Structure formats: C-alpha cells, structure tokens
C-alpha cells in the first residue's frame with residue numbers, strides 16, 4: 186500500500202495473510218485473501234497458478250505483522266485449492282482472477298469467529314456501487330514501487346471506483362480492461378495498492394453494508410498517473426462461487 190497508514194488486524198478482521206513454505210523450511214509471504222465463510226477464503230488465482238500444490242500454503246487469520254505472532258491469531262492449512270478453469274494472463278490484464286481455499290486447522294476445524302477474526306459478506310447480483318464511491322483496501326504490499334521488501338506492519342488506504350467507460354479510455358487501459366473487471370484509484374495518484382497486495386479485499390460500503398466488491402488483481406505501476414488498480418468484480422462470479430463452495 187502506497188501512502189495510507191499503518192493499521193492492526195482488529196480494524197480488518199476478514200483479512201487473511203497467505204504464506205508459502207519452501208523446501209529447506211523458509212516461509213515467505215504470498216498474497217492477501219478474504220474470509221467469506223468459516224471454511225472458505227477467496228483470493229486471486231494468479232497468486233497460486235505457478236505453485237498449485239495445496240500442501241505448500243499456510244493461511245493466518247488474526248495476524249497484524251508480517252513476522253510476529255499477534256495475540257489471538259490462528260493458523261491453518263489448505264484442504265482444497267480451487268482455481269477458476271478459464272484463468273489467463275495477458276501482458277497487463279488477468280482474466281477470471283479468482284480462487285477459493287477451503288481451510289482447516291491441524292485439529293480439522295474451520296475458523297472460529299472472534300474479535301480479530303470475522304467473515305465479509307458477498308455482494309448481490311447486478312448491484313455494485315456507482316462510480317465515485319470510496320472503498321478501502323488492505324495489505325502487506327510495497328510502500329513505494331522501488332522498494333524490494335514489504336512493510337512489517339499491516340497498512341490500509343482509501344480509493345474511489347472508476348466507470349468502465351473511463352477506464353477503457355486510451356490513456357487509461359483501452360480495451361484491455363473488460364466488463365468482468367472493476368477499476369479504482371486516488372484522483373491525486375498519491376495512494377494505491379501495489380505488488381504484495383494481490384488477492385486482498387476491495388471493500389465498499391453499499392446501502393449501509395460492508396461488502397467484498399473486488400479482489401486486488403492488477404495495475405500498471407503503483408499510484409502512477411492515469412493507471413488505476415484493477416480488481417476482479419465479485420458480482421459477476423456469484424454463480425461460480427456458490428457452485429464451488
């Protein structure tokens with residue numbers, strides 16, 4: 186997250202920190218994710234497509250720092266890693282960038298909701314917020330595009346939704362962005378999601394309820410002028426989410 190501010194997990198309790206274990210024992214951060222139900226985390230297929238072995242992943246709920254066991258956190262392994270069968274990646278644009286991870290503790294249980302661990306509701310069919318709406322994003326992604334390490338403390342910021350008509354303009358993304366994707370950015374281009382933030386939640390308050398409107402997916406640069414963040418539009422995928430869960 187470029188700009189924004191440091192935060193803790195009690196402020197974004199549906200946030201899942203997804204890590205990968207390597208031969209030799211080192212563990213590294215992969216992407217964020219969102220808890221939609223006690224047993225299911227939704228993320229982005231691009232985060233796992235090149236290492237599609239469910240046994241490699243570690244998922245934490247209730248965690249605020251990248252390398253510290255926050256009081257109240259809980260750790261899980263992945264019982265089922267489901268990738269959309271028509272995922273694909275062009276030079277910039279990623280398609281059907283959506284994945285589901287059924288989670289389970291070592292004792293065989295799903296998540297236990299608490300003060301620092303909670304689900305985030307899915308959106309309804311044909312009803313996303315209008316362009317101009319402010320939505321929040323969260324992640325352990327880079328703080329500056331030229332950084333090579335991630336911040337140790339979780340961060341969050343606020344950005345505004347951009348219409349499909351505007352995002353398809355030539356200086357923005359042209360016909361590369363489709364109706365199955367949603368754009369969002371800062372009008373002053375000083376804050377945004379960045380690498381390391383993929384798979385994380387784009388949460389919008391609509392009709393009074395917080396909903397998982399998007400999943401961090403892609404973008405040219407980070408907080409770069411005329412290049413918004415692009416997010417998987419969850420409402421299009423309700424038939425696929427219900428079928429696979």
Ligand SMILES: N=C(N)c1ccc2cccc(Nc3ncccn3)c2c1
Nearest residue numbers: 330378379380402403404406407414
């Ligand atoms: N602009 C986004 N919101 C956004 C969202 C998701 C992204 C994921 C990976 C890489 C990016 N781009 C990137 N460019 C330069 C240095 C590091 N990352 C991204 C950008």
